[PDB]
Design a protein around this ligand. Sequence first.
Ligand code: HEM
Ligand code: HEM
Ligand SMILES: C[C@H](O)[C@H](O)[C@H]1CNc2nc(N)[nH]c(=O)c2N1
Ligand SMILES: C[C@H](O)[C@H](O)[C@H]1CNc2nc(N)[nH]c(=O)c2N1
Ligand SMILES: CONC(=N)NCCC[C@H](N)C(=O)O
Ligand SMILES: CONC(=N)NCCC[C@H](N)C(=O)O
Ligand SMILES: [Zn+2]
Lengths: 407, 411
Amino acid sequence: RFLKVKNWETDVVLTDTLHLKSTLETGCTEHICMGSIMLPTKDQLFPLAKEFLDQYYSSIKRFGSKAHMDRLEEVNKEIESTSTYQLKDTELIYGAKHAWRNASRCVGRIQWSKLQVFDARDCTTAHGMFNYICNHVKYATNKGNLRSAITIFPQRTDGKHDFRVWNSQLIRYAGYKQPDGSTLGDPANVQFTEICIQQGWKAPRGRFDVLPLLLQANGNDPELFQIPPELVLEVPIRHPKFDWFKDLGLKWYGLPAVSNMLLEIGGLEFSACPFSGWYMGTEIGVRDYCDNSRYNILEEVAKKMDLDMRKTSSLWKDQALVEINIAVLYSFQSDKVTIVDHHSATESFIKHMENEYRCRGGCPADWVWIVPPMSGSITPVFHQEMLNYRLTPSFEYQPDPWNTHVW
Amino acid sequence: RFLKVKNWETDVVLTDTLHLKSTLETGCTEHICMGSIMLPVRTKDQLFPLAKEFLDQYYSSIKRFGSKAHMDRLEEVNKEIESTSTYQLKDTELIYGAKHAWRNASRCVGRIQWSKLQVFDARDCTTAHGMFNYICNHVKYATNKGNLRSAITIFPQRTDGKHDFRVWNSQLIRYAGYKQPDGSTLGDPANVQFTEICIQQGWKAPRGRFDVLPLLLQANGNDPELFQIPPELVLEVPIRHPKFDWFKDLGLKWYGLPAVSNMLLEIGGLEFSACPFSGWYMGTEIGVRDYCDNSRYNILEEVAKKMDLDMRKTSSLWKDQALVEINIAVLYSFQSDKVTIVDHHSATESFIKHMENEYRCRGGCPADWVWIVPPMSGSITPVFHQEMLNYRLTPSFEYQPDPWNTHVWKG
Ligand code: HEM
Ligand code: HEM
Ligand SMILES: C[C@H](O)[C@H](O)[C@H]1CNc2nc(N)[nH]c(=O)c2N1
Ligand SMILES: C[C@H](O)[C@H](O)[C@H]1CNc2nc(N)[nH]c(=O)c2N1
Ligand SMILES: CONC(=N)NCCC[C@H](N)C(=O)O
Ligand SMILES: CONC(=N)NCCC[C@H](N)C(=O)O
Ligand SMILES: [Zn+2]
């Protein structure tokens, strides 16, 4: 029940013990592996609070100290009295950093301890949420020198006073179904774009329209806000060798800022907790640009290169893919906007894994998400065995608010 | 119980019921997923249920379930097991068994082809020379002058575990690897240990970069013996590029016939420890893994140099650029020489059609995403976007330990 992981390129073996601390379930069983599946009260709360505070006090090397026993006693009194409890700033910061640390799908976790935590638990209105979010956007963007940050709105109470950001990311492009039957802009965002339009947003109906924020404070109906354009750093996409690439009219935004997940710390649930780092190049150039269900540009690019598109075995798709990804990196680099290539990021993740094995006894990692969507086996993560398991504090999926909201 | 899998590109949802017929364990639990781990004798008692389960599956597939012929066969195997402690498969059951081991192989992207498999029954084989002859016949048949035909040759099953038939090679055709005194490797680094064994057993190594290894063949638990495959039977393809004329001067070639020879075939509880099988290549096996893994031929640098790529920063994606050109060269070379090969786009697209068919007609298709997704260009192939369920069905191909680690030497 101590487990080994081997790297098949280097023969390095690591022993995992951290998995024994894992609490939540994976979706797998002895009979079936679900590794490739995308989405697999008072009495409940006190064990969860205890588990967390124990790890917190252990981390500041004060386990079993009076300050430990006193905080446990105090929270226990507070749950008994109010049915919830409030985290100290120090615990909140620890919790959020560790939720990133525990994120098994995240290749960038070498950065986990450098996270700016913005405490927005005093927020009461959607206007206040807009303010906090602009401040986060501007802080994280930092004129292109990106800095990781999370903004944490008030925790769930009875479940009818939820804070939610309706957007899937703070910054994303609109998608529109056309009379044609084709899609203009980002097909991933068609339904959300419709909810915005139906809410009064007037869309430019273009290929790259930054969506408005749709913010829900305290379980109320959500409200629209335009992020000031000067706060949205975008990069026009050009190629260092192909003069025609810029005519494709492509651009992307600099700040990736996931805003639809739920942060769980010590059993408390932070349903609105937008966080941001910076992009790995493949996210935009392979997935956002080349997925069939996304901007799906492989065909237009291949044509401009004059490749033989008659047969798959000419590898015309693969050739265009490499070029598109070269252009994304070149463009962010030329404009001084932080970006990481898939070679650099995966090399750092292997080094992080070794650190975590050494100092913590393991590192939960989901191979299916960690290996980049191009050139998998030429990155070292491909050859690295990983164990996937669930630790808390964590980031969790939650259902989309419109399926849940009672208007 | 019903399990759904979704394709995130097409929104197609499929429903799996076949997993209920799975008995063997995956390595995962409720608390841990071991989906990326490469590797996560038998009483007369345990043997009859395994035989029964298999014969029920066979008679079902032939629309003869519960027939007198089905009942008499169960009775006959039962009597044979308690009398002799094992049993012999009928030829038709052996064919059925081997095809199904392939159909059930969750790591295999080529399974659309599963019902087209030439089964060579070598269970009358007794000596290593006999094994050599069977294997030459398999190679010549499978090769078919470049028009590759899938095949398997099945040597006698395990009895007491002391008389095993084993092919010590990991594939029938592979290149020697040699560790040099300065610590560099000549040839294929994957085959260094095996190469050292062959040399010790008496092989005279030419010591070049692409020396076809001799066969090392163990019959009936005896010490293994060396044999040279006749060079006329080993089809190879020199690698060149359609636009880059310097590519040929890299001196690269590869063999046409991929023939895995170290796995164990389990049918109805019987263990076939020597069961070499062969199909044809998907391009990336050679052009991505065999050529570009750091632990294999490792040609990325030398190629990118010749392409004059910017090699001072990884973010130029020089490695990715060279990678694509190499893989073009491999497909171009095989196609030009009329040797069967499949590109990763074709193969994955075919797999998805296979998988959808299997859900509809079989109730499922166990698949290992980690292995199914190609090692380059993952997300522009449809399998990247397909959720899969991995579980183990019998008959099956299984790993077994390398024979030099377990063999009792007779001297
Ligand atoms: C600093 C730069 C960072 C890099 C380069 C990075 C890298 C990545 C990449 C490439 C993915 C996969 C995204 C996808 O395929 O959609 C990912 C997922 C994830 N990342 Fe990180 N990350 C970074 C910062 C962070 C921060 C600051 C947090 C939290 C505070 C975090 C938490 C996660 C989570 C929870 C997922 C899974 C999201 C999902 O399931 O959709 N990341 N990250
Ligand atoms: C017909 C042409 C075939 C193609 C294109 C094909 C394709 C592949 C590929 C690309 C892999 C992964 C190989 C690797 O990474 O090492 C594989 C694995 C496998 N294939 Fe197929 N295959 C074919 C025929 C067959 C046949 C005839 C059998 C058995 C009768 C078979 C059984 C398997 C098994 C058991 C594995 C897993 C091997 C392992 O775990 O090392 N394949 N196949
Ligand atoms: C079905 C499959 O799990 C799905 O396509 C996954 C595969 N790996 C991934 N990996 C990352 N980083 N992001 C993703 O969206 C996905 N999608
Ligand atoms: C550690 C990891 O499981 C290992 O490198 C796997 C990944 N996927 C693979 N997929 C295929 N087809 N072949 C392989 O050898 C591997 N290697
Ligand atoms: C730092 O934030 N994490 C990321 N690098 N990406 C988060 C998700 C972004 C998404 N894959 C996208 O391509 O927009
Ligand atoms: C037909 O056999 N199936 C294959 N396509 N490959 C089997 C294993 C071959 C191995 N990956 C190789 O590169 O030599
Ligand atoms: Zn699993």
